[PDB]
Design a protein around this ligand. Structure first.
Ligand SMILES: [Mg+2]
Ligand SMILES: [Mg+2]
Ligand SMILES: [Mg+2]
Ligand SMILES: [Mg+2]
Ligand SMILES: [Mg+2]
Ligand SMILES: [Mg+2]
Ligand SMILES: [Mg+2]
Ligand SMILES: [Mg+2]
Ligand SMILES: [Mg+2]
Ligand SMILES: [Mg+2]
Ligand SMILES: [Mg+2]
Ligand SMILES: [Mg+2]
Ligand SMILES: [Mg+2]
Ligand SMILES: [Mg+2]
Ligand SMILES: [Mg+2]
Ligand SMILES: [Mg+2]
Ligand SMILES: [Mg+2]
Ligand SMILES: [Mg+2]
Ligand SMILES: [Mg+2]
Ligand SMILES: [Mg+2]
Ligand SMILES: [Mg+2]
Ligand SMILES: [Mg+2]
Ligand SMILES: [Mg+2]
Ligand SMILES: [Mg+2]
Ligand SMILES: [Mg+2]
Ligand SMILES: [Mg+2]
Ligand SMILES: [Mg+2]
Ligand SMILES: [Mg+2]
Ligand SMILES: [Mg+2]
Ligand SMILES: [Mg+2]
Ligand SMILES: [Mg+2]
Ligand SMILES: [Mg+2]
Ligand SMILES: [Mg+2]
Ligand SMILES: [Mg+2]
Ligand SMILES: [Mg+2]
Ligand SMILES: [Mg+2]
Ligand SMILES: [Mg+2]
Ligand SMILES: [Mg+2]
Ligand SMILES: [Mg+2]
Ligand SMILES: [Mg+2]
Ligand SMILES: [Mg+2]
Ligand SMILES: [Mg+2]
Ligand SMILES: [Mg+2]
Ligand SMILES: [Mg+2]
Ligand SMILES: [Mg+2]
Ligand SMILES: [Mg+2]
Ligand SMILES: [Mg+2]
Ligand SMILES: [Mg+2]
Ligand SMILES: [Mg+2]
Ligand SMILES: [Mg+2]
Ligand SMILES: [Mg+2]
Ligand SMILES: [Mg+2]
Ligand SMILES: [Mg+2]
Ligand SMILES: [Mg+2]
Ligand SMILES: [Mg+2]
Ligand SMILES: [Mg+2]
Ligand SMILES: [Mg+2]
Ligand SMILES: [Mg+2]
Ligand SMILES: [Mg+2]
Ligand SMILES: [Mg+2]
Ligand SMILES: [Mg+2]
Ligand SMILES: [Mg+2]
Ligand SMILES: [Mg+2]
Ligand SMILES: [Mg+2]
Ligand SMILES: [Mg+2]
Ligand SMILES: [Mg+2]
Ligand SMILES: [Mg+2]
Ligand SMILES: [Mg+2]
Ligand SMILES: [Mg+2]
Ligand SMILES: [Mg+2]
Ligand SMILES: [Mg+2]
Ligand SMILES: [Mg+2]
Ligand SMILES: [Mg+2]
Ligand SMILES: [Mg+2]
Ligand SMILES: [Mg+2]
Ligand SMILES: [Mg+2]
Ligand SMILES: [Mg+2]
Ligand SMILES: [Mg+2]
Ligand SMILES: [Mg+2]
Ligand SMILES: [Mg+2]
Ligand SMILES: [Mg+2]
Ligand SMILES: [Mg+2]
Ligand SMILES: [Mg+2]
Ligand SMILES: [Mg+2]
Ligand SMILES: [Mg+2]
Ligand SMILES: [Mg+2]
Ligand SMILES: [Mg+2]
Ligand SMILES: [Mg+2]
Ligand SMILES: [Mg+2]
Ligand SMILES: [Mg+2]
Ligand SMILES: [Mg+2]
Ligand SMILES: [Mg+2]
Ligand SMILES: [Mg+2]
Ligand SMILES: [Mg+2]
Ligand SMILES: [Mg+2]
Ligand SMILES: [Mg+2]
Ligand SMILES: [Mg+2]
Ligand SMILES: [Mg+2]
Ligand SMILES: [Mg+2]
Ligand SMILES: [Mg+2]
Ligand SMILES: [Mg+2]
Ligand SMILES: [Mg+2]
Ligand SMILES: [Mg+2]
Ligand SMILES: [Mg+2]
Ligand SMILES: [Mg+2]
Ligand SMILES: [Mg+2]
Ligand SMILES: [Mg+2]
Ligand SMILES: [Mg+2]
Ligand SMILES: [Mg+2]
Ligand SMILES: [Mg+2]
Ligand SMILES: [Mg+2]
Ligand SMILES: [Mg+2]
Ligand SMILES: [Mg+2]
Ligand SMILES: [Mg+2]
Ligand SMILES: [Mg+2]
Ligand SMILES: [Mg+2]
Ligand SMILES: [Mg+2]
Ligand SMILES: [Mg+2]
Ligand SMILES: [Mg+2]
Ligand SMILES: [Mg+2]
Ligand SMILES: [Mg+2]
Ligand SMILES: [Mg+2]
Ligand SMILES: [Mg+2]
Ligand SMILES: [Mg+2]
Ligand SMILES: [Mg+2]
Ligand SMILES: [Mg+2]
Ligand SMILES: [Mg+2]
Ligand SMILES: [Mg+2]
Ligand SMILES: [Mg+2]
Ligand SMILES: [Mg+2]
Ligand SMILES: [Mg+2]
Ligand SMILES: [Mg+2]
Ligand SMILES: [Mg+2]
Ligand SMILES: [Mg+2]
Ligand SMILES: [Mg+2]
Ligand SMILES: [Mg+2]
Ligand SMILES: [Mg+2]
Ligand SMILES: [Mg+2]
Ligand SMILES: [Mg+2]
Ligand SMILES: [Mg+2]
Ligand SMILES: [Mg+2]
Ligand SMILES: [Mg+2]
Ligand SMILES: [Mg+2]
Ligand SMILES: [Mg+2]
Ligand SMILES: [Mg+2]
Ligand SMILES: [Mg+2]
Ligand SMILES: [Mg+2]
Ligand SMILES: [Mg+2]
Ligand SMILES: [Mg+2]
Ligand SMILES: [Mg+2]
Ligand SMILES: [Mg+2]
Ligand SMILES: [Mg+2]
Ligand SMILES: [Mg+2]
Ligand SMILES: [Mg+2]
Ligand SMILES: [Mg+2]
Ligand SMILES: [Mg+2]
Ligand SMILES: [Mg+2]
Ligand SMILES: [Mg+2]
Ligand SMILES: [Mg+2]
Ligand SMILES: [Mg+2]
Ligand SMILES: [Mg+2]
Ligand SMILES: [Mg+2]
Ligand SMILES: [Mg+2]
Ligand SMILES: [Mg+2]
Ligand SMILES: [Mg+2]
Ligand SMILES: [Zn+2]
Lengths: 107, 64, 149, 99
RNA sequence: GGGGGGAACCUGGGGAACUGAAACAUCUCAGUACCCAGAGGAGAGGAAAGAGAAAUCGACUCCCUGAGUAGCGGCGAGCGA
RNA sequence: CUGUUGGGAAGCAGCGCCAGAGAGGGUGAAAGCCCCGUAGGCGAAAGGUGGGGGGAUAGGUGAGGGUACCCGAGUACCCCGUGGUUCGUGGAGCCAUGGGGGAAUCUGGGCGGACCACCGCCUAAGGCUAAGUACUCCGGGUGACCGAUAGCGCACCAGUACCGUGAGGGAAAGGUGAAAAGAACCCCGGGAGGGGAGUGAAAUAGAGCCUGAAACCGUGGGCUUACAAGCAGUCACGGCCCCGCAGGGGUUGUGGCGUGCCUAUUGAAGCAUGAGCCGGCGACUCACGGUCGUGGGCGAGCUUAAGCCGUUGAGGCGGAGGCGUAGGGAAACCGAGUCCGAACAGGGCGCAAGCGGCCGCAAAGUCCGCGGCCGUGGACCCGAAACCGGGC
RNA sequence: GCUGGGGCUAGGAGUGAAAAGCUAACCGAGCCCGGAGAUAGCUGGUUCUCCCCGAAAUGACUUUAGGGUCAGCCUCAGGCG
RNA sequence: GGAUGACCCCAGGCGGUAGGGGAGCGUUCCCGAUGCCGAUGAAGGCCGACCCGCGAGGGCGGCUGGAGGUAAGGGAAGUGC
RNA sequence: ACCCGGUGAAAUUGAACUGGCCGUGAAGAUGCGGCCUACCCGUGGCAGGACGAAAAGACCCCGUGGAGCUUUACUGCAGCC
């Protein structure tokens, strides 16, 4: 029952390591069965394709390769830092994701 | 498992105080009539076994 | 005195004889069994303590002495035990059976009997019987024997 | 064994009997700071004995600390470490032993 | 209510031989292997017509010791409370 | 968190913080503080369990006298045939029962190893009974357990392919990379394949994909070889070749010497065994018990077993019991003696036990560790022809 | 007489115009799985290095004789000298 | 000798199958390890005419390899073809 | 069968740089001694040698190994009385 993630499409996040340590963008997809994500314009690689309708008289293309989940951190839309989430119960008391730094929401 | 004592041995032999083995002299169970009084009587005395055979007998009585 | 100082005394852990391991080692090939015959074979050799070639064994030519007893059990009866005088020097006062047992002197469940090799210290002792000549050295050395039951 | 082990650690000066642990109610950094005033900054390993879940709890998690209760004093653990910091009832259980 | 199944484990009714005895037949292997019945989460046993010498213990089961003792045995090989 | 090296930090560096959490595992390499977790706590509407606590019900509970109504039948019991027991016909009881004979109802009856007496112990021929015990299909935890010829037969779509009419037998076969970025397009080619190009840190990581040994096949190079006789090497000298600057390495012309390895045997180069070659599996062990030796602990003593407690890689308890302190004798029995004997002859088997001035020192003995052996098990490893059982 | 289709008899057992023939390509006792790692006084085979000593193929007894027990001979630790 | 195997002087022994005794090398695993080496390159593989050891070996260097390895001292074995 | 093109096995194999005589040798030598002879490599043919291959001799002995058979061998059992 569910690979416990730590990220939602489309949290704005920070590639915390690798070729793109430092990039920041929106998680476009999550693939929990593989445990990796794809963030806007991160892990870009050239793929060769063929002369078919769709890519007609084609050549190469560019693709956004996924990235190992753990290797990416969520940015707080208040305190603005890279961070980690702790889980707060309200009075309701519903669960929320709240920046471990400031303490305010992350949606 | 535990070794078993050789019951045949424990019925024929004795371990002495100082390690010797001891048995009954053979040769007066029967056919006695003609045997000398000197023979008949000397076959009373227990005798000590010669060590190599005594020592072998010993290993057969682990618990004594 | 730490962990890499912990270390067995000189030869209190010998290495083990390892037959079957090449020439130089000393016992390879035959691995010390020499050549062929029953005694080489994986199995023995029958019991060297009695087998004598098929001969009548040196044990079983010997006769049998006295009562072997027979079904059902052994007769159960009053078993004794010898404790001397030279032994009771390690006490002063009265001496009893159960006491003597605890001393590591008497095998329990045997009826103590006192037999005198040695010198009788002025004591009161309590035995299930006394060797006639323990009675002697003990009485006349100022003591009191209690034949108990 | 148990005699000799301690006996060696003392003989080296690296033993130390303590009466009770000041500022420490089961909370690492406390102990950590207590130990500071104690004469051990953990540049040497510590075998630490007391029946006091509170003390040995703050005193767990540290590299240089081997925790123990006092009925569980054992000679591997003594030699295993560098510095024994026992304690007084710990000391009497250990003394109730060698008798 | 039964019927069939289920890795071993258990009880019951039957039940070997090679092997050991340096041959072999009583003896051994062994009431073992295995067939069959049955029961169950266990099974069997179980409130003395017991034990056996203490004028004593006090259902059964299982563990350690008793003890390789008492004994059994072509008094052999071995078997064994 | 930052910097730095690197394809890539988690490395190294600067400065910090958490720890009832520095178990473990991942993340482009080596992370207490990035991810999963870990310590510590929290959680059930439904199903199941519920031996703990709560309740209710079936259920249970006197003394003396008198009477002599009852107290398990083809049963006891006796005999014949067996079985069980340590008990193999033994002095052979006990408990079980196939065949015959066959009771009694407390002044009844069974047992205490033939039987008799006494002195006792117990109430047979109806049935049920938890727990403590066994196992491991399953699920969790942990390994001085294995790492793809190992570990299960099976890491892989294996009880499969395949083999057998059948019962049944029974395999092989894991790994690109961090990421498919899995090579567009171009050229020879029918294709397979390859050559550019393109990706990648790396493409002798290119899918027949980590590493990539050895046998085995080839191309290129140095020495050498067609008048020579050989277990193929060795010693010596010389030539040419390379590395170098009185030194090495390579090769081999001439000379001297020279009968493979293993095994089995009195004796083998042997025309006695085995081996095509390489690689990889392949044989002296384990437990309990003996007997020596040995390193330690204690010493007329030494030592716990099962279990109880404690910890979950903490040890403690437990003296039941075991060997040792006295032997001799079939035994009764006696004891530094005892046995044989009429002997207070004589013999057999025993006892005399270490150094100083209680201590020491050392040990009789015992406990543990280690080593050599022996007994019980398959007991160093492969090997029958056969015997027996259930099945096909 | 030969023959197709449908049937029955099997392991100390079947079937046999008799050969110990045949019973699923080897039958004086089938095949499979099990006892089972049966037993093999027999044959093979037994794996690194270097140091010290160093044999025997005799005697007695042996349902023994190419196997063993005791003695002879080698070796290691203690002791005497 | 000297002083408790430090190392020197001297004399002597040192063929060896069955077999006995000794001293060592290496492989897997454990404590040493929360450690220590390691992408400035682990284990493995391929060279070497160098260094140490009598030897089994162990060092050291170059190429390969691409994520492991693990000391002094001890322990345990599925330990050497 | 032989030559050319196409496809392409096998047992066996210690390694080979594998000649003759007379001797020698575990008693029948390409391999040892002394001579003798002999340029290197093949194709087709022949079977004297390699004590050629194959099958752990099937004959003979040995095994206190097995099995089928036999009877006035032993001891049992069925069956019959
Ligand atoms: Mg969640
Ligand atoms: Mg006797
Ligand atoms: Mg006679
Ligand atoms: Mg007589
Ligand atoms: Mg005993
Ligand atoms: Mg004794
Ligand atoms: Mg060992
Ligand atoms: Mg040795
Ligand atoms: Mg060697
Ligand atoms: Mg040796
Ligand atoms: Mg040798
Ligand atoms: Mg060999
Ligand atoms: Mg030997
Ligand atoms: Mg041997
Ligand atoms: Mg021989
Ligand atoms: Mg022999
Ligand atoms: Mg044998
Ligand atoms: Mg007796
Ligand atoms: Mg810690
Ligand atoms: Mg920890
Ligand atoms: Mg530590
Ligand atoms: Mg049964
Ligand atoms: Mg039968
Ligand atoms: Mg037999
Ligand atoms: Mg026979
Ligand atoms: Mg026979
Ligand atoms: Mg039996
Ligand atoms: Mg059923
Ligand atoms: Mg239960
Ligand atoms: Mg039950
Ligand atoms: Mg009752
Ligand atoms: Mg008799
Ligand atoms: Mg950079
Ligand atoms: Mg960083
Ligand atoms: Mg750092
Ligand atoms: Mg922890
Ligand atoms: Mg690190
Ligand atoms: Mg980590
Ligand atoms: Mg928890
Ligand atoms: Mg009546
Ligand atoms: Mg009867
Ligand atoms: Mg019977
Ligand atoms: Mg009977
Ligand atoms: Mg009989
Ligand atoms: Mg009987
Ligand atoms: Mg009776
Ligand atoms: Mg009857
Ligand atoms: Mg009956
Ligand atoms: Mg009556
Ligand atoms: Mg009865
Ligand atoms: Mg009766
Ligand atoms: Mg009774
Ligand atoms: Mg009686
Ligand atoms: Mg009774
Ligand atoms: Mg009754
Ligand atoms: Mg009843
Ligand atoms: Mg019942
Ligand atoms: Mg029941
Ligand atoms: Mg029960
Ligand atoms: Mg089990
Ligand atoms: Mg591993
Ligand atoms: Mg496999
Ligand atoms: Mg591999
Ligand atoms: Mg397999
Ligand atoms: Mg499986
Ligand atoms: Mg087929
Ligand atoms: Mg089929
Ligand atoms: Mg993939
Ligand atoms: Mg075409
Ligand atoms: Mg192509
Ligand atoms: Mg090309
Ligand atoms: Mg290409
Ligand atoms: Mg490469
Ligand atoms: Mg590669
Ligand atoms: Mg390949
Ligand atoms: Mg890899
Ligand atoms: Mg490769
Ligand atoms: Mg290749
Ligand atoms: Mg060439
Ligand atoms: Mg030339
Ligand atoms: Mg010429
Ligand atoms: Mg020439
Ligand atoms: Mg010549
Ligand atoms: Mg030269
Ligand atoms: Mg030459
Ligand atoms: Mg010469
Ligand atoms: Mg030659
Ligand atoms: Mg060789
Ligand atoms: Mg031979
Ligand atoms: Mg010969
Ligand atoms: Mg021969
Ligand atoms: Mg020989
Ligand atoms: Mg030859
Ligand atoms: Mg031969
Ligand atoms: Mg040959
Ligand atoms: Mg061979
Ligand atoms: Mg072949
Ligand atoms: Mg090999
Ligand atoms: Mg051994
Ligand atoms: Mg084992
Ligand atoms: Mg031993
Ligand atoms: Mg003392
Ligand atoms: Mg004690
Ligand atoms: Mg006696
Ligand atoms: Mg008399
Ligand atoms: Mg006398
Ligand atoms: Mg002492
Ligand atoms: Mg001692
Ligand atoms: Mg021995
Ligand atoms: Mg065997
Ligand atoms: Mg038969
Ligand atoms: Mg059958
Ligand atoms: Mg027909
Ligand atoms: Mg038909
Ligand atoms: Mg018919
Ligand atoms: Mg049939
Ligand atoms: Mg049938
Ligand atoms: Mg059958
Ligand atoms: Mg068939
Ligand atoms: Mg046929
Ligand atoms: Mg048959
Ligand atoms: Mg048969
Ligand atoms: Mg057939
Ligand atoms: Mg069997
Ligand atoms: Mg051999
Ligand atoms: Mg010599
Ligand atoms: Mg005879
Ligand atoms: Mg002979
Ligand atoms: Mg023989
Ligand atoms: Mg001998
Ligand atoms: Mg000797
Ligand atoms: Mg010299
Ligand atoms: Mg010499
Ligand atoms: Mg020598
Ligand atoms: Mg390794
Ligand atoms: Mg560690
Ligand atoms: Mg590590
Ligand atoms: Mg570093
Ligand atoms: Mg790099
Ligand atoms: Mg490199
Ligand atoms: Mg390397
Ligand atoms: Mg790693
Ligand atoms: Mg290591
Ligand atoms: Mg080591
Ligand atoms: Mg092995
Ligand atoms: Mg052609
Ligand atoms: Mg073709
Ligand atoms: Mg030639
Ligand atoms: Mg010629
Ligand atoms: Mg001749
Ligand atoms: Mg001649
Ligand atoms: Mg000739
Ligand atoms: Mg020659
Ligand atoms: Mg010649
Ligand atoms: Mg030709
Ligand atoms: Mg020919
Ligand atoms: Mg043959
Ligand atoms: Mg043959
Ligand atoms: Mg024939
Ligand atoms: Mg024969
Ligand atoms: Mg015979
Ligand atoms: Mg014979
Ligand atoms: Mg036989
Ligand atoms: Mg037959
Ligand atoms: Mg009939
Ligand atoms: Zn924030």
């Amino acid at each position: 029952m569910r690979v416990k993630m730590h990220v939602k499409k489309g949290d704005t996040v920070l590639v915390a390591s690798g070729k793109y340590k430092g990039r920041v963008g929106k998680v476009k997809e999550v693939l929990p069965k593989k445990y990796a994500v794809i963030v806007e314009g991160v892990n870009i690689v050239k793929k060769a394709v063929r002369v078919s309708p769709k890519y007609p008289q084609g050549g190469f293309i560019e693709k956004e390769a996924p990235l190992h989940a753990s290797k990416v951190r969520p940015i707080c839309p208040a305190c603005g830092k890279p961070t980690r989430v702790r889980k707060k119960f309200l009075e309701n008391g519903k669960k929320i994701r709240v920046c471990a730094k400031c303490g305010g929401a992350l949606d | 498992p535990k070794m078993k004592t050789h019951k045949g041995a424990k019925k024929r032999v004795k371990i002495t105080a100082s390690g010797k083995v001891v048995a009954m002299k053979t040769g007066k169970r029967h056919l006695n009539w003609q045997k000398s009084g000197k023979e008949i009587r000397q076959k009373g005395r227990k005798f000590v076994l010669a060590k190599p055979e005594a020592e072998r007998i010993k290993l057969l009585l682990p618990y004594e | 005195m730490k962990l890499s100082d912990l270390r067995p005394n000189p030869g209190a852990n010998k290495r083990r004889k390892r037959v079957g391991r090449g020439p130089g080692s000393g016992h390879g090939k035959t691995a010390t069994r020499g050549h062929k015959g029953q005694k080489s074979r994986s199995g023995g050799l029958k019991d060297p303590r009695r087998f004598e070639g098929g001969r009548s064994t040196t044990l079983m030519r010997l006769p049998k002495r006295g009562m072997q007893g027979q079904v059902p059990g052994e007769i159960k009866r009053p078993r004794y035990q010898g404790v001397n005088l030279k032994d009771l020097a390690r006490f002063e006062g009265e001496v009893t059976p159960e006491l003597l047992v605890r001393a590591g002197l008497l095998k329990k469940g045997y009826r103590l009997k006192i037999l005198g090799e040695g010198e009788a210290k002025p004591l009161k002792v309590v035995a299930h019987a006394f060797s006639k000549s323990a009675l002697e050295k003990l009485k006349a050395a100022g003591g009191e024997p209690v034949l108990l039951e | 064994g148990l005699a000799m082990a301690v006996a060696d650690r003392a003989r080296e000066g690296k033993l130390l009997l303590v009466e009770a642990f000041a500022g420490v109610n089961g909370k690492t950094k406390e102990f950590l700071a207590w130990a500071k005033e104690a004469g051990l900054d953990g540049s040497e390993s510590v075998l630490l004995v007391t029946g006091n879940e509170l003390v040995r709890r703050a005193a767990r998690n540290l590299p240089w600390v081997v925790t123990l209760a006092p009925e569980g004093l054992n000679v591997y653990d003594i030699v295993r470490t560098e510095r024994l910091v026992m304690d007084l009832d710990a000391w009497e259980v250990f003394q109730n032993r060698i008798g």
